[PDB]
Amino acid sequence: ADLIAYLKQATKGGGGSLVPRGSGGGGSRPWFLEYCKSECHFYNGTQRVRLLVRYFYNLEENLRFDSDVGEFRAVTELGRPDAENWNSQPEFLEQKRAEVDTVCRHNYEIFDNFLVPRRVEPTVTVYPTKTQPLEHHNLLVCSVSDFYPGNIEVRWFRNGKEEKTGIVSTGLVRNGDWTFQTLVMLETVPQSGEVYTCQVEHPSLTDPVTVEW
């Protein structure tokens, strides 16, 4: 088990006070949130890497650090003080700029061992689902569930003819537990002379999963 690094949080300095900027409340319970996201953007593994730190106060993002810039940039006036306070600290800037390596790249290397390579195969099953009066558009449902990563193509073929219209989907759906699912339905009126096929392609598979109806 190799240690995962992280970005050390910097201290803000009191002093100034900005004219009552963004208002809000209207009765709602007054809350105060300090929130920060440090994002490691891998455009192709550690080959291309961009670190993006974003500070938020309540509902507004106010301060930012795009590694491509090398300095903190205020997004709203609320965060300028910090921009000025930290950018004038030549020491700090170096520490941050280097985190793209000592943290982003550092961690990715680790993560490339079990996360990047992770693969869970989908489960495909087609089926109709509506009352039988057929006073709608007999929705042919193609369920591709329990798969990872998200990347996936779910195509419908009516008599070898790819249905490029009438396809109602939920889109990709995140389960929160490192697994996805999706529903690509097809509006049509079934006929024992037509064969609708649901093709499914995805990194875990080796050969497009074909299901018929």
Binding site: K12, G14, G24, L33, E34, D146
Partner: protein, 182 residues
């Protein structure tokens, strides 16, 4: 080939609740988060545990700074609050629902802040407190949050479920509804 991925280190401190959070995210999923109080690393999936390690103290230290920063922010904005943003609740089963075959129910809470809520599962109007679990507050692209609540269950015609979500940005609790459909 080409591996595009994004790792996020999301963290926050909230008042007055005095709640803190420190978590890592991979391509949208939680890798792990730290139990601030019990000072320990909780992996989203158990398996992840043998492939790496994280020093939870690291997170606490950070939350300290975060907590402090919050005060400067309050002192800098003259304690001006903002509105609360109520969540969108969605309930869907984790897998295709087959009768008598054990499945899971996912309550999806999204687009909201502050990062706090009270969630309750209802099996036939009866609160469920077993076979349930929840994720911590998850980062979104913007400034809001999303969350997940899970309920283990056994599909049966005679049953109906409800996910009740309460958030300060709501007048009355939101009660989404899920009932077996074939």
């Amino acid at each position: 080939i080409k591996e595009e991925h994004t790792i996020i280190q999301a963290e926050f401190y909230l008042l007055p609740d005095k709640r803190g959070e420190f978590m890592f995210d991979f391509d949208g999923d939680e890798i792990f988060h730290v139990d601030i109080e019990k000072s320990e690393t909780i992996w989203r999936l158990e398996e992840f545990a043998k492939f790496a390690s994280f020093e939870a103290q690291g997170a606490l230290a950070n939350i300290a700074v975060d907590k402090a920063n919050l005060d400067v922010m309050k002192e800098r904005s003259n304690n001006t609050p903002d509105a609360n943003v109520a969540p969108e609740v969605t309930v869907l089963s984790r897998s295709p629902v087959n009768l008598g075959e054990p499945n899971i129910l996912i309550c999806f809470i999204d687009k909201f802040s502050p990062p706090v809520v009270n969630v309750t599962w209802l099996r036939n109007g009866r609160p469920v407190t077993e076979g349930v679990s929840e994720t911590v507050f998850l980062p979104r692209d913007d400034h809001l949050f999303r969350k997940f609540h899970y309920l283990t269950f056994l599909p049966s015609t005679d049953d109906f479920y409800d996910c009740e979500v309460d958030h300060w940005g709501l007048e009355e609790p939101l009660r989404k509804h899920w009932e077996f459909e074939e």
